[PDB]
UniProtKB/Swiss-Prot annotation, chain B:
Function: Component of the 26S proteasome, a multiprotein complex involved in the ATP-dependent degradation of ubiquitinated proteins. This complex plays a key role in the maintenance of protein homeostasis by removing misfolded or damaged proteins, which could impair cellular functions, and by removing proteins whose functions are no longer required. Therefore, the proteasome participates in numerous cellular processes, including cell cycle progression, apoptosis, or DNA damage repair. In the complex, PSMD11 is required for proteasome assembly.
GO terms classed as biological process: proteasome assembly; stem cell differentiation; ubiquitin-dependent protein catabolic process
UniProt PTM: Phosphorylated by AMPK.
Record's keyword annotation contains Ubl conjugation: yes
Modified residues (N-acetylalanine): 2
Chief place where the protein resides: nucleus
Entire protein: shown range: 1 to 211 of 422
Subunit structure: Component of the 19S proteasome regulatory particle complex. The 26S proteasome consists of a 20S core particle (CP) and two 19S regulatory subunits (RP). The regulatory particle is made of a lid composed of 9 subunits including PSMD11, a base containing 6 ATPases and few additional components.
Keyword vocabulary terms for this entry: Acetylation, Cytoplasm, Isopeptide bond, Nucleus, Phosphoprotein, Proteasome, Ubl conjugation
Residues annotated with Phosphoserine modification: 14, 23
Species name: Rattus norvegicus
Entry's family note: Belongs to the proteasome subunit S9 family.
Protein name: 26S proteasome non-ATPase regulatory subunit 11
Top-level taxonomic group: Eukaryota
Swiss-Prot record, chain E:
Subcellular location: Cytoplasm; Nucleus
Residue positions where N6-acetyllysine is found in the record: 48, 52
Top-level taxon in the UniProt lineage: Eukaryota
Span within the parent record: 350 to 418 of 418
Subunit structure: Component of the 19S proteasome regulatory particle complex. The 26S proteasome consists of a 20S core particle (CP) and two 19S regulatory subunits (RP). The regulatory particle is made of a lid composed of 9 subunits, a base containing 6 ATPases including PSMC4 and few additional components. Interacts with NR1I3. Interacts with PAAF1. Interacts with TRIM5. Interacts with ZFAND1.
Protein family according to the UniProt entry: Belongs to the AAA ATPase family.
Membrane-spanning intervals of the chain: none
Known role: Component of the 26S proteasome, a multiprotein complex involved in the ATP-dependent degradation of ubiquitinated proteins. This complex plays a key role in the maintenance of protein homeostasis by removing misfolded or damaged proteins, which could impair cellular functions, and by removing proteins whose functions are no longer required. Therefore, the proteasome participates in numerous cellular processes, including cell cycle progression, apoptosis, or DNA damage repair.
Name this polypeptide is given: 26S proteasome regulatory subunit 6B
UniProtKB/Swiss-Prot annotation, chain I:
One annotated Gene Ontology cellular component of this protein: cytoplasm
Family, similarity comment: Belongs to the peptidase T1A family.
Protein name: Proteasome subunit alpha type-2
Lineage: Eukaryota, Metazoa, Chordata, Craniata, Vertebrata
NCBIfam families: PRK03996.1
Keyword Phosphoprotein: yes
Keyword flag Acetylation: yes
Curated annotation (Swiss-Prot), chain J:
Residues with N6-acetyllysine modification: 57, 206, 230
Classification lineage: Eukaryota, Metazoa, Chordata, Craniata, Vertebrata
Entry-annotated residues carrying N-acetylserine: 2
Cellular component annotations (GO), alphabetically ordered: cytoplasm; nucleus; proteasome complex; proteasome core complex; proteasome core complex, alpha-subunit complex
Organism of this sequence: Rattus norvegicus (Rat)
Tissues in which the protein is found: Ubiquitous.
Alphabetized UniProt keyword annotations: Acetylation, Cytoplasm, Nucleus, Phosphoprotein, Proteasome
Protein name: Proteasome subunit alpha type-3
Coiled coil feature spans: none
Name of the coding gene: Psma3
Entries under InterPro entries matching the protein: Ntn_hydrolases_N (IPR029055), Proteasome_alpha (IPR050115), Proteasome_alpha-type (IPR023332), Proteasome_asu_N (IPR000426), Proteasome_sua/b (IPR001353)
GO MF, one example: ubiquitin protein ligase binding
Subunit field text: The 26S proteasome consists of a 20S proteasome core and two 19S regulatory subunits. The 20S proteasome core is a barrel-shaped complex made of 28 subunits that are arranged in four stacked rings. The two outer rings are each formed by seven alpha subunits, and the two inner rings are formed by seven beta subunits. The proteolytic activity is exerted by three beta-subunits PSMB5, PSMB6 and PSMB7. Interacts with AURKB. Interacts with CDKN1A. Interacts with MDM2 and RB1. Interacts with the C-terminus of TBXA2R isoform 2. Interacts with DNAJB2.
């Protein structure tokens, strides 16, 4: 369906995603952004079923907003984990959302992967959507388990590009979201792997195939 | 762009040490970077620079060096467009005026400054700037150039009388008409300055000069 | 006192220090001997300890004992510098009340007058300073010392 | 899932814990840490499915936290193991979560508890748990004896976990061992380059 | 001005803190400062004695430190 | 009418006076002074410190469980000044909310979140004419993550604000103005330095002059994740240095 | 109220722990007693005491000696006294609040 | 009852007498020669200036008779 | 933990025909800190006095000038505690709106919501109204906006307004100094001057807070930036 | 003041310019009226000594008793109005019972005391209800938390004491505690002491007549709050009588 | 606006984009499943009368949900002068549907609208549980949404005339009634412009 990863590197956090957002394995839309920008500090990657993921991010975003403003501490990924676990329990474990919360605290940058389980899951470096294990499996492979920031950013982009190649569901532009805690650089075109063929030639017709007997403006 | 605190300090150390001749290359750089607002948000970087440019002229006063600084500020004044903008202009004319390097530079600079104050900047600023131009000509004893300007100064600035600044132009003008031996004009202008002086928004010193 | 605090004056009127002022006064013939050799550190540390209390009484025993060594200090043009520092330092802190110290300092100023011609003139200016601030005995001593400088 | 174990020490506890919880082929948690606290008096080692353990884990944390600050001296461990019981009594035909609680409270003195997913709470010497981490029955019995020496206890725990990860599938990857004394938990991480490999089963 | 002064004593901080104190209040604090100098046995009044006085005798510099609403 | 609104209701229940602000609310600040406790808190860069009386009045009262330094939770602790009845009541309410926050929200609790949360509650109490504006004032210490060590104080009125230095109690005005002179003649804050400033302010103002068994000092340190009372050992070492200071 | 008739505002405020200690010795001075070291007990117990309350405890204690049938004050009688007066004053109505 | 701040009136024949009464209790004149047996229904009505512990030394509360006390009264 | 509440008549009409409580609440806001809001039509600028009269207050995160959400902010005058609950409440409404729409709440919409709260406090008994006047700012839907809400529960539209001490003089100084079709820079300059015309005297950068509002968002500037501005104004 | 129809004693939400709350204070004068209840902490238990008021001639034991069991190992002695005390017994016993059920260990006195105090304190704040007219002690022995004594007044304060008195004689009775070393001392010896203090303090106008009730909760009872044996009561009574002569 | 299921009450919307305008065609039928007996009753609502949202399928959930949403729209419209954008309504619809449990309202939305009164065009389509997608290309929506999008992407020159478009989109409808069976007969085109609503009646089988 969707192919999302976010990473903990030696810099901050790099999220990688294919564009396409699908209602099942078929595209509802071939435009917009799968990885979503929320408040300035919080970025969230989305994966699995579309319907469950967008709405979960949105609801938690209000809660997190209240907590950030009052507390006047920057958002913690462990904190973010607990809120999703409690909310998703409230709903009663309906739908499938593998969610990637990633925010920078005053300490290091912290990244977590929350599956729909309502777990308290601490990764090391994680990729979500599809099958949780299947995406996670890549991180162990390409990352030596820490390398410089620039090298790591090419690395995630390359690993995510391979999942786009292997699984045609993801389509269009690959976006990279470099997320700090006030800087959200949304690079639409990190890599474009595929694009369509021009829709130059019409399938238009004159009225003589269907006609009109009205042109009026009601009041 | 890359000026930060360091270059501002360096230029400052440079002036303190030897003089102006070393600081021009650096100076040129800080002003050019300022066109944006330097790095990131305005912060102490912009404060330190704005303060540094006002105070810079009129230490060892006159020189070719003082002139070099003058060219650099001309794109800069427009480009800032904040509350602090107001501050560059008022400072820089006042110190420059105190120690006149020469007539041409000051008259021409001031004119550009007025044009900018007149359209899409506040009324408040305009009144400080105008007082410099009239004061300069009078010192020079070119009464004629001050008298021409004097008419505009009276009419335009009149909208604000709840200010010290308006008192100042009217006083400067009365001294000039007196010299020409335009005696009704000088007398009328002198009462006019005292009328606007009545405001209790004027600080003690303005009152002392008025007597 | 009413300088701002009072924790040194009233609040703790007995301290480690006041008691110290008494024991160190007996030890003074040795203390004076060490001062003659130099030992700029040795004399000052005890002086400071004694005068961190703003009661007139404690200050009086401590002030008495330091004065005798001071004549030598004034004589040698390496020592004299040390003495001055306490008067200016005590005054700045939370004060020490000028009356107690002022009687002893008066006699310090008299000593600097006759030693030598030229380095005495610098020392005279500095000593005249230590005296200046009192409303007490010092006023006459202050005027007289200025008069000495004037003559040369 | 994870091999979790705790064996009773000198007057306190020695722990063992694995690092994967598997739902068949897909890893529910690729990285699992069951060494962390849940108050400074009690620690527990959590087994079964990922979601069932996590929900229990956050409530005992909340109740326990309020109790140590409200009382003024900390609470005892016996309270912590009863808090987990309550939850399981509701969930005894739906979920299950097999928690084995150990540390030491200062106030009444050392405790080793097993609170089950049916709801019970009982005192044991050593309990090891999970679904497929029940395959060390011989191993736990031979190793544990009444008041086992601390050096022996340390070796036996690491050794028991190894037998687990090889033989059961669910287990695997870095064994997290923790030895606890009266106010302090000290963890060592034993490589997954080290594992003793099973000898001739064919 | 009437009093003799030290060169440690700087007026500026003290006046800045309120926006105004009454005529009768200027007179008292100065009178207090002048008396305080007598205890010290110093004709010159210091920054410490003067500061203490400014704050005292009229009192109540801060009454929004907990009493804000 | 003069000498309070006795033909009026304005000190009888909560409703605005003809003069603007309530009699009752102003009056609540007067209940603090009754407690007999004065607290001085000083903000440093090593710890944020509270110095309050350990002071016991008899052999019959505990001192092994009577303290006005309270551990709201590990990172953040507080002191209550004023009425003892109201003092406990806020502490328990604060403790429960602190556990509940940590559990649900998952965020670590800074100085601001407890302070602001209580303050909003104490606004409701002031606002209702059943409840009364609080008899106590809470001065919190705790480490802010962005700022560093922070000292906040919340009003019984329901206002919270940050402080580099604060004082609350019988001599609220006298101690804060005293501490103001200490800020002005600034101290580069070491561990020992913030503790020293707090005790000298309180010793001068009360004019008792404390010793180490008579005070108990509360620190929340940048290497201590928990709230700890320094007790007599460290206090005496500072105490002597205080006599040698000025 | 405004200065220039009341420039100096001296407030003779409630005497400290240390202040009560020396004043009780003087008070102790005409008192015929078995002995008194109880000064320390008396100060710790005292809450809101002013000068009048201090003289009072000394009288109240001597009164208990008369019930005892002794012209010598017991150590028990000073301790009894501080607590009692302390209790009565606070319970009935507390002191007047005014600027300090 | 002196809680005065009375910006409007407040009598003050009564104020003068309240202050004068303190003065006579004070040891300008003896108080070992004059003893005061004071009866007032409540101390709630009364102000602390009067009560003290060196204007009125003992505070003796009078509860309503006990069960045995009423039999003695009869 | 046993109460029903009391609701009683001091919150009903007097014989004069005006509400006894509202007049008193307006008195509370007059006693407050002065606060100016100016709509530039190039952004909205709001200025208040930072001070609380002792400057032993840390305020590097505690401010009088608080963002509600991404580009709407409130500045207040009047009572500090009452404002604190109104700040917190206002946010909660903003986020509720944020869940449904995706855009942050308009200043026009937000005031009505807040107004209901002010109203409950007046109309029911056993409570009393909030004594805080609000300057609500935003830039949204292509126009910058300034609203006023006074303590009674009225909302009024102004393009330049002054509050607190010498609310009357501020409105006249704004009329005089600020003219229409000037820029944002000019707006920022005029507000600090209205605060000069509204409590006068000494200013430091810890006695003023200035915050600027755009679609980029509301931000309260750092202490340094505010310092540069001071020097400009008389 | 005390005679009024608005606020003061009607309310307790009211404050005077001093800061006082008169209603909460009137509740305190109410605890004072009846005889003394003392409870003494030992390093091994608590011993109570209570005057049990004899209000008639047709008495049976336990009649108008002031000794309650909050928990198995907590005893509660009340002083002041017994009407308010019965409602307070139900609330304290209930907080303890649920505690035992959930936590499964002996209620810490520090926790129980905080919860009842909060409840008293919720009423003192309120002008909607009056606050309880009694003051009580909770005293206990456990080996999971040690021997603890707490005291809760009509205001809503909980602080630990090592020896406390509530009721009329408490200022006199408390003095007798400073004389005794009671922090370290067997519960067997302390029973002898609580009994002698009560006999001397009683007089025929604090209350007509009393029945001596002492209670155990210590090493002797093995951590159980029980009433003392017939033997124990009488020897402690005897020592009280012999000291009285 | 929104409805329950996808073709279980007919209704199919397809949009082609013109530089100036958006053209939308839908059949004008109505009645559950296969039968589409009656032909007078609406599915598309106006949310500024220059912005529309249409939810398509069962009429009951169509009228109940549409009206209940209109009350909240209206209150916002009157309050703030600037009546709510395109963007605001897509998000409002996503949140309103997810909120229910009983009789789950899963619409397949077609928003047809230039923003406000301004001349900037938008077309969008959403999924069954209708998370929002920003797009400015072309949109087809219904049970078989992906079929109408494919074909809507292929037909235009780039942006034909508005005139040319009413005729294309009408033909797009006519072929589609044959591909399903849950709707058929009668076709209405609403050319949605920035200042006007042109309603045109397309030729029916």
């Amino acid at each position: 369906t969707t192919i999302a990863g976010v990473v903990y590197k030696d810099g901050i956090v790099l999220g990688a995603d294919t564009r396409a957002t699908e209602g099942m394995v078929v595209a509802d839309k071939n435009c917009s952004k799968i990885h979503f920008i929320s408040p300035n500090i919080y970025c969230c990657g989305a994966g699995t079923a579309a319907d469950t993921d967008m709405t979960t991010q949105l609801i938690s975003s209000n809660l997190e907003l209240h907590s950030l403003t009052t507390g006047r501490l920057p958002r913690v990924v462990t904190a973010n984990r607990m809120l999703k676990q409690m909310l998703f329990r409230y709903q009663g474990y309906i739908g499938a959302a593998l969610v990637l919360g990633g925010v920078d605290v005053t300490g290091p940058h912290l990244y977590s992967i929350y599956p729909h389980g309502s777990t308290d899951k601490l990764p090391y470096v994680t990729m979500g959507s599809g099958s949780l294990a299947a995406m996670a499996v890549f991180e162990d492979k390409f990352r030596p388990d820490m390398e410089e920031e620039e090298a790591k950013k090419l690395v995630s982009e390359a690993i995510a590009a391979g999942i786009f190649n292997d699984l045609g569901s993801g389509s269009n532009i690959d976006l990279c979201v470099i997320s700090k805690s006030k800087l959200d650089f949304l690079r639409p075109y990190s890599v474009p792997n595929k694009k369509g063929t021009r829709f130059g030639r019409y399938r238009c017709e004159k009225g003589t195939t269907a006609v009109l007997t009205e042109k009026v403006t009601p009041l | 762009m890359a000026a930060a605190a360091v270059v501002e300090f360096q230029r400052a150390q440079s002036l303190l040490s030897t003089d102006r001749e070393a600081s021009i290359d650096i100076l040129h750089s800080i002003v050019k970077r300022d066109i944006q607002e330097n790095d990131e948000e305005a912060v102490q970087v912009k404060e330190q620079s704005i303060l540094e440019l006002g105070s810079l002229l009129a230490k060892t006063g006159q020189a070719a060096e003082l002139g070099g600084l003058l060219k650099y500020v001309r794109p800069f004044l427009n480009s800032i467009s904040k509350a602090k903008a107001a501050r560059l202009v008022r400072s820089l004319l006042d110190l420059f005026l105190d120690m006149e390097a020469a007539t041409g530079q000051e008259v021409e600079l001031c004119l550009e400054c007025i044009e900018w104050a007149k359209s899409e900047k506040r009324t408040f600023l305009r009144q400080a700037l105008e007082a410099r131009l009239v004061s300069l000509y009078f010192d020079t004893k070119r009464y004629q150039e001050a008298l021409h300007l004097g008419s505009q100064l009276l009419r335009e600035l009149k909208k604000m009388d709840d200010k010290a600044l308006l008192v100042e132009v009217q006083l400067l003008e009365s001294k000039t008409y007196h010299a020409l031996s335009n005696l009704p004009k000088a007398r009328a202008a002198l009462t006019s300055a005292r009328t606007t002086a009545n405001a209790i928004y004027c600080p003690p010193k303005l009152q002392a000069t008025l007597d | 006192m009413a300088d701002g605090g009072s924790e040194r004056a009233d609040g703790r009127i007995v301290k480690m220090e006041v008691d110290y002022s008494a024991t160190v006064d007996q030890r003074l013939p040795e203390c004076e001997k060490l001062a003659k050799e130099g030992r700029l550190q040795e004399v000052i540390e005890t002086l400071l300890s004694l005068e961190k209390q703003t009661r007139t009484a404690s200050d009086m025993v401590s002030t008495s004992r330091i004065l005798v060594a001071v004549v030598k200090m004034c004589y040698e043009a390496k020592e004299w510098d040390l003495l001055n520092e306490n008067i200016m330092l005590l005054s700045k802190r939370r004060s020490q009340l000028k009356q107690a110290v002022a009687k002893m300092v008066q006699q310090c100023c008299t000593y600097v007058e006759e030693i030598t011609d030229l380095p005495v003139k610098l020392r005279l200016i500095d000593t005249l300073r230590m005296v200046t601030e009192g409303k007490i005995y010092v006023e006459i001593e202050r005027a007289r010392l200025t008069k000495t400088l004037a003559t040369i | 899932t994870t091999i979790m174990a705790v064996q009773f020490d000198g007057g306190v506890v020695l722990g063992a814990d694995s690092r994967t919880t598997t739902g068949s082929y897909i890893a529910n948690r690729v990285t699992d840490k069951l060494t962390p606290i849940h108050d400074h008096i009690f620690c527990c080692r959590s087994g079964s499915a990922a979601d069932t353990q996590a929900v229990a884990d956050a409530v005992t944390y909340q109740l326990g936290f309020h109790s140590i600050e409200l009382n003024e001296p900390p609470l005892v461990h016996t309270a912590a193991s009863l808090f987990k019981e309550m939850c399981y009594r509701y969930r005894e035909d739906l979920m299950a979560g097999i928690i084995i609680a150990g540390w030491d409270p200062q106030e009444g003195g050392q405790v080793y508890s097993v609170p089950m997913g049916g709801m019970m709470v009982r005192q044991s010497f050593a309990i090891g748990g999970s679904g497929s981490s029940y395959i060390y029955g011989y191993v736990d019995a031979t190793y544990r004896e009444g008041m086992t020496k601390d050096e022996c206890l340390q070796f036996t725990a690491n050794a028991l976990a190894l037998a687990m990860e090889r033989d059961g599938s669910s287990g695997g990857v870095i064994r997290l061992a923790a030895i606890q004394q009266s106010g302090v938990e000290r963890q060592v991480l034993l490589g997954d380059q080290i594992p003793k490999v099973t000898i001739s089963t064919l | 001005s009437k009093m003799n002064l030290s060169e440690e004593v700087d007026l500026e901080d003290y006046v800045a803190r309120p926006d105004k104190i009454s005529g009768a209040d200027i007179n008292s604090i100065c009178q207090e400062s002048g008396m305080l100098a007598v205890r010290e046995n110093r004709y010159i009044v210091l920054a410490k004695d003067f500061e203490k006085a400014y704050k005292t005798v009229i009192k109540k510099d801060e009454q929004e430190h907990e009493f804000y609403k | 009418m003069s000498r309070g609104s006795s033909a009026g209701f304005d000190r009888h229940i909560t409703i605005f006076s003809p003069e603007g602000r309530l009699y009752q609310v102003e009056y609540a600040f007067k209940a603090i002074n009754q407690g007999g406790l004065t607290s001085v808190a000083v903000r440093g860069k090593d710890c944020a410190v509270i110095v309050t009386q350990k002071k016991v009045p008899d052999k019959l009262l505990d001192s092994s469980t009577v303290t006005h330094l309270f551990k709201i939770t590990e990172n953040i602790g507080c002191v209550m000044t004023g009425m003892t009845a109201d003092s406990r009541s806020q502490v328990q309410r604060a403790r429960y909310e602190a556990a509940n926050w940590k559990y649900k929200y998952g965020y670590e609790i800074p100085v601001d979140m407890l302070c602001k949360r209580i303050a909003d509650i104490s606004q409701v109490y002031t606002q209702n004419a059943e409840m009364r504006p609080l008899g106590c004032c809470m001065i919190l210490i705790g480490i802010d993550e962005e700022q560093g060590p922070q000292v906040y104080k919340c009003d019984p009125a329901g206002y919270y604000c940050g402080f580099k230095a604060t004082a609350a109690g019988v001599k609220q005005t006298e101690s804060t103005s005293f501490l103001e002179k200490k800020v002005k003649k600034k101290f580069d804050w070491t561990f020992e330095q913030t503790v020293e400033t707090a005790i000298t302010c309180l010793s001068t103002v009360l004019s008792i002059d404390f010793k180490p068994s008579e005070i108990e000092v509360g620190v929340v340190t940048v290497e201590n994740p928990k709230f700890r009372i320094l007790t007599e050992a460290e206090i005496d070492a500072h105490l002597v240095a205080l006599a040698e200071r000025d | 109220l405004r200065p220039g008739r009341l420039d100096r505002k001296i407030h003779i405020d409630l005497p400290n722990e240390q202040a009560r200690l020396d004043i009780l010795k003087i008070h102790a001075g005409p008192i015929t007693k078995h002995g008194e070291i109880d000064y320390e007990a008396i100060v710790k117990l005292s809450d809101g005491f002013n000068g009048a309350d201090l003289r009072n405890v000394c009288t109240e204690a001597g009164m208990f000696a008369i019930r005892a049938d002794h012209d010598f004050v017991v150590q028990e009688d000073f301790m009894k006294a501080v607590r009692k007066v302390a209790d009565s004053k606070k319970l009935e109505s507390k002191l007047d609040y005014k600027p300090v | 009852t002196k809680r005065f701040d009375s910006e409007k009136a407040g009598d003050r024949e009564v104020q003068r007498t309240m202050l004068e009464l303190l003065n006579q209790l004070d040891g300008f004149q003896p108080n070992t020669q004059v003893k005061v047996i004071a009866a007032t229904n409540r101390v709630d009505i009364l102000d602390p200036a009067l009560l003290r512990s060196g204007r009125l030394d003992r505070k003796i509360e009078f509860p309503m008779p006990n069960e045995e006390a009423r039999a003695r009264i009869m | 933990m046993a109460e029903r509440g009391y609701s009683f008549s001091l919150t009903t009409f007097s014989p004069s025909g005006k509400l006894v409580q509202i007049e008193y609440a307006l008195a509370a806001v007059a006693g407050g800190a002065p606060s100016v809001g100016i709509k530039a039509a190039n952004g909205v600028v709001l200025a208040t006095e930072k001070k609380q009269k002792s400057i032993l207050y840390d305020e590097r995160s505690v401010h009088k000038v608080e963002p509600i959400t991404k580009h709407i902010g409130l500045v207040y005058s009047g009572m500090g505690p009452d404002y604190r609950v109104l700040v917190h409440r206002a946010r909660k409404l903003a986020q509720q709106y944020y869940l449904v729409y995706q855009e942050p709440i308009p200043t026009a919409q937000l005031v009505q919501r807040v107004a209901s709260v002010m109203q409950e406090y007046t109309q029911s008994g056993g409570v009393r109204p909030f004594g805080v006047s609000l300057l609500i700012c935003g830039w949204n839907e292509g126009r910058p906006y300034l609203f006023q809400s006074d303590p009674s529960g009225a909302y009024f539209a102004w393009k330049a307004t002054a509050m607190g001490k010498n609310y009357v003089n501020g409105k006249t100084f704004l009329e005089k100094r600020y003219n229409e079709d000037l820029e944002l820079e000019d707006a920022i300059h005029t507000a600090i001057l209205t605060l000069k015309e509204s409590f006068e005297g000494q200013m430091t950068e810890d006695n003023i807070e200035v915050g600027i509002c755009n679609e980029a968002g509301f931000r309260r500037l750092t202490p340094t930036e505010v310092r540069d501005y001071l020097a400009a104004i008389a | 003041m005390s005679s009024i129809g608005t606020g003061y004693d009607l309310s307790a939400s009211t404050f005077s310019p001093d800061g006082r709350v008169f209603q909460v204070e009137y509740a305190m004068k109410a605890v004072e009226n009846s005889s003394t209840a003392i409870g003494i902490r030992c390093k091994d238990g608590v011993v109570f000594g209570v005057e049990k008021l004899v209000l008639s001639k047709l008495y049976e034991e336990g009649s108008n008793k002031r000794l309650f069991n909050v928990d198995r190992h907590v005893g509660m002695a009340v002083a002041g109005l017994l009407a308010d005390a019965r409602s307070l017994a139900d609330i304290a016993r209930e907080e303890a019972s649920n505690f035992r059920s959930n936590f499964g260990y002996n209620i810490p006195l520090k926790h129980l005391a905080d919860r009842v105090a909060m409840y008293v304190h919720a009423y003192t704040l309120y002008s909607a209800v009056r606050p309880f007219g009694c003051s009580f002690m909770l005293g206990s022995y456990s080996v999971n938390d040690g021997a603890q004594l707490y005291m809760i007044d009509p205001s809503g304060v909980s602080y630990g004491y090592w020896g406390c008195a509530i009721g009329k004689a408490r200022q006199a009775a408390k003095t007798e505690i400073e004389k005794l070393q009671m922090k370290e001392m067997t519960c067997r010896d302390v029973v002898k002491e609580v009994a002698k203090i009560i006999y001397i303090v009683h007089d025929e106008v604090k209350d007509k007549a009393f029945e001596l009730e002492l209670s155990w909760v210590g090493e002797l009872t093995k951590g159980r709050h029980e009433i003392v044996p017939k033997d124990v009561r009488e020897e402690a009574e005897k020592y009280a009588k012999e000291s009285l002569k | 606006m929104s409805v329950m299921s996808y073709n279980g009450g007919a209704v199919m919307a397809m949009k082609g984009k013109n530089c100036v305008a958006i053209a939308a065609d839908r059949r004008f039928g109505i009645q559950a499943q296969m039968v589409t007996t009656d032909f007078q009753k609406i599915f598309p609502m106006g949310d500024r009368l220059y912005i529309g949202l249409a939810g398509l399928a069962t009429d009951v959930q169509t009228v109940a949900q549409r009206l209940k949403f209109r009350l909240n729209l209206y209150e916002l419209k009157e309050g703030r002068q600037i009546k709510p954008y395109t963007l605001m309504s897509m998000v409002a619809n996503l949140l309103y549907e997810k909120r229910f449990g009983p009789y789950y309202t899963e619409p397949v939305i077609a928003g047809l609208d230039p923003k406000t009164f301004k001349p900037f065009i938008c077309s969008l389509d959403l999924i069954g549980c209708p998370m929002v997608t920003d797009d400015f290309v072309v949109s087809g929506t219904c049970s078989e949404q992906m079929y109408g999008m494919c074909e809507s992407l292929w037909e235009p020159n780039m942006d034909p005339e508005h005139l040319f478009e009413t005729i294309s989109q009408a033909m797009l409808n006519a072929v589609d009634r044959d591909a399903v069976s849950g709707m058929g007969v009668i076709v209405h085109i609403i050319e949605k412009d920035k200042i006007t609503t042109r309603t045109l009646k397309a030729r029916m089988d």
